[PDB]
């Protein structure tokens, strides 16, 4: 079951005195939480955003964040003073865990400075990434003094995280299994050459993301299929496009095939010409 938790954060600092730190949270592919720098609280985006957690357990966390944000923003400001960093700044954090079957889990807490890794939290302390500049060692010293923050983080990764996802998993049960059937059509983009044609197969509106689209000749697979990106719809579904550069005289017989979980045995089969 590929359902990891991703607690994500974006901190800005345009100069000495302008900052926004907006965040969010993903459970697999779905957005569960939304944390705007306007809000005191983390907004819950689902009827099941609180796992099995009580309101007071959730309050305990709501507080830890509200402190973390404000503390963070001043600390970064001081590191800039301490490490001589020029002030167009961009910090990010990726924190969370996934729960494997059996007993336990693996967790993570990575932070990044101007889109490059600088440090992760490993076990009981902060650790600098291999590629990281030297001034990181200095920040990492200053961080590893703070035993309370260090232990809080350790508790949040080993303890809270997997208790939370386990709750999220079973209290989100009916929505995580959920199925939305994709719809598909055919079009005709710019022809890649003189006598050729570009066959175009669109597919949109499927919630379980893992999908399978391939152009096929005589019901059996064919090689020139060129798939696109799996892009997001407004209503938290997905859209895939797939193109084939064929000669005009053998567009006849070709077929776009769609394999998705919402469809059982039967698959979606579309034939050319039917644009």
């Amino acid at each position, epitope marked *: 079951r590929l359902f990891p938790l991703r607690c994500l954060q974006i901190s800005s600092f345009a100069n000495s005195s302008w900052t926004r730190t907006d965040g969010l949270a993903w459970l697999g592919e779905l957005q569960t939480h939304s944390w705007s720098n306007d809000s005191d609280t983390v907004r819950s985006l689902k009827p099941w955003s609180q796992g099995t957690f009580s309101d007071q357990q959730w309050e305990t966390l709501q507080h830890i964040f509200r*402190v973390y944000r404000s503390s963070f923003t001043r*600390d970064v400001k001081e590191f800039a*003073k301490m490490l001589r960093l020029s002030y167009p700044l961009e910090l990010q954090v990726s924190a969370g865990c996934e729960v494997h079957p059996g007993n336990a889990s693996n967790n993570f807490f990575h932070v990044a400075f101007q889109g490059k890794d600088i440090l992760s939290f490993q076990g009981t302390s902060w650790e600098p990434t291999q590629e990281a500049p030297l001034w990181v060692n200095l920040a990492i010293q*200053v961080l590893n*003094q*703070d*035993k*309370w*923050t260090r232990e809080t983080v350790q508790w949040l990764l080993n303890g809270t995280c997997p208790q939370f996802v386990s709750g999220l998993l079973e209290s989100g049960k009916s929505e995580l299994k959920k199925q939305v059937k994709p719809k598909a059509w055919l079009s005709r983009g710019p022809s890649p050459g003189p006598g050729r044609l570009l066959l175009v197969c669109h597919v949109s509106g499927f919630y379980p993301k893992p999908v399978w689209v391939k152009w096929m000749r005589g019901e059996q697979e064919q090689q020139g299929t060129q798939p696109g990106d799996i892009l997001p719809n407004a209503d938290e579904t997905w859209y895939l496009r797939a193109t084939l550069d064929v000669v005009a005289g053998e567009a006849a017989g070709l077929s776009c095939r769609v394999k998705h979980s919402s469809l059982e045995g039967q698959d979606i089969v579309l034939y050319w010409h039917h644009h």
Partner: T-cell receptor
Framework: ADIYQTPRYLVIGTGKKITLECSQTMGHDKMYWYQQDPGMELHLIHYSYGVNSTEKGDLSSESTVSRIRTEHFPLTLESARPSHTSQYLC??????????????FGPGTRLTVTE | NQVEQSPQSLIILEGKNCTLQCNYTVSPFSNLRWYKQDTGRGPVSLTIMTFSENTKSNGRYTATLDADTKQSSLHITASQLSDSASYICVVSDRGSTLGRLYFGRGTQLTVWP
């Protein structure tokens, strides 16, 4: 062992330059400068994270500090006026044992600026 | 100020006990420290306690902490003449050199023979 200051007392004429010496062997990185008027609380004026770093504090004074060697944190006062007559205290934090960074203070310099 | 001390000044006879009070409003609170400032000298640190710990025993001086009620007492046992000093109460809003220190304006203790 220890942190140091020179001189214990200093009397200077209103107009001349002022150097206040502070030495620290402990290898401490973070260092403070404090001012204290007879009776009143301590006001932090300057602080250094070590290395090559010098920052202003919660009091907006006239002095400048520099930190070109770990061991040395000299406070320099350019103008020198009656308003500068105080006691001036050097300090440094840095690990001694268990974990929390204790703060260690100098013996201080009592300045007096006369007309 | 965010760090308040009581009493302002007190006078005790040598070889008697006494207790000094400290209350704070510093948020976030990490650690409370007691400083002994003998006249015309530098402060000497005596005790450092965290939100976590509730009592630190440094020889004759013993500190108390209640992060619940944001209150810390210091307690001198079998006092002597060398105790007569200003006692500063300091609070840190971080558990590393990255935080600020908020100083009290001190309690003035006098010990008489």
């Amino acid at each position: 062992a220890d942190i140091y200051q020179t001189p214990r007392y200093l009397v200077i004429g209103t107009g001349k330059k002022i150097t206040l010496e502070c030495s620290q062997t402990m290898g401490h990185d973070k260092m403070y400068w404090y001012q204290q008027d007879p009776g009143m609380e301590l006001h932090l004026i300057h602080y250094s994270y070590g290395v090559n770093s010098t920052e202003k504090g919660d009091l907006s004074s006239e002095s400048t500090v520099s930190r070109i060697r770990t061991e040395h944190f000299p406070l320099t006062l350019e103008s020198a006026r009656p308003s500068h007559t105080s006691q001036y205290l050097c300090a440094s934090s840095g690990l001694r044992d268990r974990g929390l960074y204790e703060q260690y203070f100098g013996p201080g310099t009592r300045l007096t600026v006369t007309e | 100020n965010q760090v308040e001390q009581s009493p302002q000044s007190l006078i005790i006879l040598e070889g008697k006990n006494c207790t000094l009070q400290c209350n704070y409003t510093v948020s976030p609170f990490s650690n409370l420290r007691w400083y002994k400032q003998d006249t015309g000298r530098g402060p000497v640190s005596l005790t450092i306690m965290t939100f976590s710990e509730n009592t630190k025993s440094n020889g004759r001086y013993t500190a108390t902490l209640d992060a619940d009620t944001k209150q810390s007492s210091l307690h001198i046992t079998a006092s002597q003449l060398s105790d007569s000093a200003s006692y500063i109460c300091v609070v840190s809003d971080r558990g590393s050199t990255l935080g600020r220190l908020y100083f009290g304006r001190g309690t003035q203790l006098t010990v008489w023979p």
